[PDB]
């Protein structure tokens, strides 16, 4: 399912993302932006061997289980084909896990480098919320 900004902006909101570990929606958003493009089947195989899934992209090195990354952990307890569904909840439920670990939303790349220190209330502009 490809989101619309907005629709999307909605979804993370209603799974309890607007403020999670003080992440305001609009870095939720941004991070998806440019991980996915909002795209919830988007798959991009790392450097490593391992593969990072869905809508914010989410590593089988340490989160989901995808039977080709060796020697890799599975801390979301889930296949990694899960986090490629319409519906965003696997992917966000992992999401508050991977935000709780110590590094914060520096664990996405994306995140880090686009929307870390920019206007990330832009990304929720128009939406009814
Ligand atoms: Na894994």
New binding site residues.
Partial sequence: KVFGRCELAAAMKRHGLDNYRGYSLGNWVCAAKFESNFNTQATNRNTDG?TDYGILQIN???????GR?PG???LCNIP?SALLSSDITASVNCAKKIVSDGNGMNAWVAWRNRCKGTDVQAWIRGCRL
């Fill in positions: 391992s089988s090195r340490w989160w989901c289980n995808d990354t890799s952990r599975n990694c």
